[PDB]
Amino acid sequence: LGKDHEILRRRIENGAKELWFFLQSELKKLKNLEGNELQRHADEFLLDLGHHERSIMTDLYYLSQTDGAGDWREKEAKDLTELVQRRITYLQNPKDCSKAKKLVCNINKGCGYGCQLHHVVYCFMIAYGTQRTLILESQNWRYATGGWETVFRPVSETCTDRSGISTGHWSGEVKDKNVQVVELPIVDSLHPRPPYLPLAVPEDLADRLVRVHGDPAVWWVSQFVKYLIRPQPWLEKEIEEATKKLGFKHPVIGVHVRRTDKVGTEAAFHPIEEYMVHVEEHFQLLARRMQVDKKRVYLATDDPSLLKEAKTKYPNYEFISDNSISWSAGLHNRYTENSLRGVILDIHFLSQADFLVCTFSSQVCRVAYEIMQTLHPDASANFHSLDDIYYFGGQNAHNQIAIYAHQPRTADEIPMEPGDIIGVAGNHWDGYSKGVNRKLGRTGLYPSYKVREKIETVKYPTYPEAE
Amino acid sequence: LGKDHEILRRRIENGAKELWFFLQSELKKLKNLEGNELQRHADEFLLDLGHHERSIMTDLYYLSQTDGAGDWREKEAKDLTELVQRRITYLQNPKDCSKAKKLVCNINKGCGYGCQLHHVVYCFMIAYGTQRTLILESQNWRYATGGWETVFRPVSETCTDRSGISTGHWSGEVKDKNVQVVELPIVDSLHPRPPYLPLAVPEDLADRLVRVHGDPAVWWVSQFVKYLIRPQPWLEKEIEEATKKLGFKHPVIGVHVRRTDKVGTEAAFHPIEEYMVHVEEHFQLLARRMQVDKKRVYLATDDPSLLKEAKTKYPNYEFISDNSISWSAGLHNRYTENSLRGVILDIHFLSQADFLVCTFSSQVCRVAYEIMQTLHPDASANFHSLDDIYYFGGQNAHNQIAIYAHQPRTADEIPMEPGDIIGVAGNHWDGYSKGVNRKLGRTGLYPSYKVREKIETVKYPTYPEAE
Ligand SMILES: CC(=O)N[C@@H]1[C@@H](O)[C@H](O[C@@H]2O[C@H](CO)[C@@H](O[C@@H]3O[C@H](CO)[C@@H](O)[C@H](O[C@H]4O[C@H](CO)[C@@H](O)[C@H](O)[C@@H]4O[C@@H]4O[C@H](CO)[C@@H](O)[C@H](O)[C@H]4NC(C)=O)[C@@H]3O)[C@H](O)[C@H]2NC(C)=O)[C@@H](CO)O[C@H]1O
Ligand SMILES: Nc1nc2c(ncn2[C@@H]2O[C@H](COP(=O)(O)OP(=O)(O)O)[C@@H](O)[C@H]2O)c(=O)[nH]1
Ligand SMILES: Nc1nc2c(ncn2[C@@H]2O[C@H](COP(=O)(O)OP(=O)(O)O)[C@@H](O)[C@H]2O)c(=O)[nH]1
């Protein structure tokens, strides 16, 4: 055992005890207070708590890094990335393209970039499970009629032709076993659904992923995003120039403010203060472990009027943003190459940030979060979503397993016994989540800490020929 | 890295986050409440917090045991105990007693048992540092004029005689370098003081002890307590019989209620409910990790009227206690052999408990806590004192090091800068401690989590010939 490891384990332990002592004392005092006297004492209480809590989260971070734990995790995560990218690349480049089994994917799903991009990942992940090379049809793409290679590398160097001796629409892996070329529709109309879908992960990688990553389901998705978004040279160069142009440096926290057409249809309007309370919080945590020269924020939004508002309200912050990109994201000009290049750039810098504050109901932020997983060993917790938990459109039921019992205090809560399977709908970021107790068919709230994630595994191919 | 180790570290991490989510939300709710509604909401809040907090402490326990950490810590602590006991036995049994260097200690210090026992421990630690054999004079002992061997084994098998060519009173290790037999007074009037005192530890054991034990200073003391209290055969049998008669079995929590002459002089009167809130708390913690057949408590007290009160007020508890021993602890019969054997038994069963709730102002509980350290790898946190932190009468200044800054919110608090040395006087068990900032000469309260223990080391002899 490590000297610093035990020191840290005990400092975290004792720090929690003192926190419990602190809580009990101040609450007993609070029960005897009223009005402003009550409200000021509660505010001072909250300030003191945040620092204490952050001291514990800092000791927890150090524990995750002490005694070579950080060095090992990066090497293993690196070995895992290399392995998958090696298998994907092998699958994507058969010797004889005319005789390879293929799966055709059409990019023109009726939605935005991140949603269309997730369609390709959904296509790619099933092509992986079926040992079929992915063929991506991207002509007449709404962001770029020139197609996929307007921005990114082709998904294959040897097999980009879709010809085959037999062709047909999706009907099942078994039924299509002797069909060379299979056309795959969007997940919304996929029947029958195969098991190669989120949030499951390859059975052969399950044990290694749990040791490294706090959310393997996102990591698995990120591996296909990592492959797809290989930039064309001019795009690679422009990212390199934008990085230098915007003075993009660390430490930096990424913020995605999705407004415009999303409001009133798939999400709500969130004031800028709802985002910045968590940015400031995180900078207070990082300050506990390093020197914060300047409080930097990369702001990605389709509201071009927001940057002036933000700079006005937070003058001690350095806001890094491309307002012309935000303007290009406008509804009247959203579906062009220039706007496409804009959102690609914004997502890149969001993914490169040290922390991500946004709304996961927007696919733009979910992509940045996914890419982030490829830049760090375990960046699963390096975010805060103002609404939805992480999800992938079309995923199988996101389930959890109750580990502690719960008796409802109100009719709006649901009971839980250890072992109950809970299908989570979301986290309210108030200590409570919302979901259904499948055993009872009741829906309602439950404490977010009394459940555990039910990790799903699928027997994927392992492509041993790629070594 | 171990799979379960990482799972636990992340679950501790997330549990703290969800606790932080829970706190902010419910506090925001509390600021808008009044009257009974306010007090009901705070009480329900505390119930939810205790369980949540205990769920985190349980995972922290598992972390201390995962991946063979429990087996290693148990093995290492065993080798350290055997090593020190091997050295002590070597020092205490020279071949030629007539030529050995000796240090004479008289047991009849004017105080109770635990205080007199600490006198011998204080004598023993200095004899150890000076490479002198301890000769214990225990005639006219107030609990047993027959002497030390009425209950315990002699401290030496070869050298119990005090003869020597030169004798003198204590005057310094340097001045006594050629004085064979040195007489040592009580610490309260000791001049000059040697460095072989609590709460310092041998320089050669610092790294190994910090790695294993959460409070090395107590472990060091416990090694001398362990040696002294080696029971005579008839005493060993009596304990074995009492264990069987009292149905002493696990799980069990030890409770020491010191009253009578202590109240109003060296401590305060504490109702039984103040003790049982922490007993119940821990049984709620233990239930999270094991099957708790029955909530057992071993009650040691000098108030013979207390046992019936407890049985009446807590009918769901099984109280193990010998009331005739409590009667023997009365002021008119305190200093007899029958009473002496009684308190020895009480301390034994207190030390054997899985947790110790008491007042550390009573030397009776400090001995049980020390002995407890010899029964487990790291039992440093297996206690709760209603008043004083751990201390050893005559210790050098117990100092701490501030790790986080603090700005006083009231005049009753003191400021701290990181690295400042703070002389601790005690912990108020409410999130605040009390002490003096030696850099400023200011005394007052400060957050208990912003400080770190300054572990002190002393170059003791190592007795390499004992191998
Ligand atoms: C000549 C002779 O033979 N002398 C012996 C003594 O050696 C023998 O033992 C001595 O007993 C005393 C008192 O039991 C003990 O003193 C303590 O030393 C502690 C360490 O420095 C110190 O912290 C203690 O002070 C607390 O308690 C006293 C009251 O006893 C209060 O007045 C103080 O304010 C302290 O109160 C604590 O304060 C903190 C912070 O405010 C609180 O967190 C905590 O809850 C408070 N606790 C209480 C109970 O209020 C105390 O001064 C000696 O260490 C000890 N010495 C030795 C060598 O054993 C004595 C035993 O009866 O008999 C004499 O004949
Ligand atoms: N450049 C840029 N474009 C954005 C931003 N937010 C939204 N957009 C545009 O709006 C589209 C929304 O499509 P989508 O990726 O499916 O995300 P969602 O509809 O918010 O879930 C994006 O693809 C962009 O074209 C932004 O912050 N920056
Ligand atoms: N048998 C028994 N005796 C006790 C108990 N509590 C106190 N006493 C007696 O009271 C004395 C107190 O002396 P001491 O050990 O120096 O500790 P302190 O005065 O409580 O700090 C003890 O030595 C016992 O003789 C108890 O729980 N059981």
UniProtKB/Swiss-Prot annotation, chains A, B:
**Enzyme class, UniProt record, top EC level:** transferase
Molecular function terms, GO-annotated: alpha-(1->6)-fucosyltransferase activity; glycoprotein 6-alpha-L-fucosyltransferase activity; SH3 domain binding
Its pathway? Answer: Protein modification; protein glycosylation
- Keywords associated with the record: Congenital disorder of glycosylation, Disease variant, Disulfide bond, Glycosyltransferase, Golgi apparatus, Membrane, Phosphoprotein, SH3 domain, SH3-binding, Signal-anchor, Transferase, Transmembrane, Transmembrane helix
Q: How is it modified after translation?
A: Tyrosine phosphorylated by PKDCC/VLK.
Catalytic reaction(s) noted = N(4)-{beta-D-GlcNAc-(1->2)-alpha-D-Man-(1->3)-[beta-D-GlcNAc-(1->2)-alpha-D-Man-(1->6)]-beta-D-Man-(1->4)-beta-D-GlcNAc-(1->4)-beta-D-GlcNAc}-L-asparaginyl-[protein] + GDP-beta-L-fucose = an N(4)-{beta-D-GlcNAc-(1->2)-alpha-D-Man-(1->3)-[beta-D-GlcNAc-(1->2)-alpha-D-Man-(1->6)]-beta-D-Man-(1->4)-beta-D-GlcNAc-(1->4)-[alpha-L-Fuc-(1->6)]-beta-D-GlcNAc}-L-asparaginyl-[protein] + GDP + H(+)
Q: Which GO terms describe its biological process?
A: fibroblast migration; GDP-L-fucose metabolic process; in utero embryonic development; integrin-mediated signaling pathway; L-fucose catabolic process; N-glycan fucosylation; N-glycan processing; oligosaccharide biosynthetic process
**Recorded coiled-coil stretches:** none
A GO cellular component annotation here is:
Golgi membrane
- Claim: Transferase is one of the keywords in the record: yes
Protein name, per record: Alpha-(1,6)-fucosyltransferase
List the source organism.
Homo sapiens
Q: What lineage, starting at the top, does this entry show?
A: Eukaryota, Metazoa, Chordata, Craniata, Vertebrata
Q: Which gene encodes it?
A: FUT8
Q: What is the covered span of the full protein?
A: 108 to 574 of 575
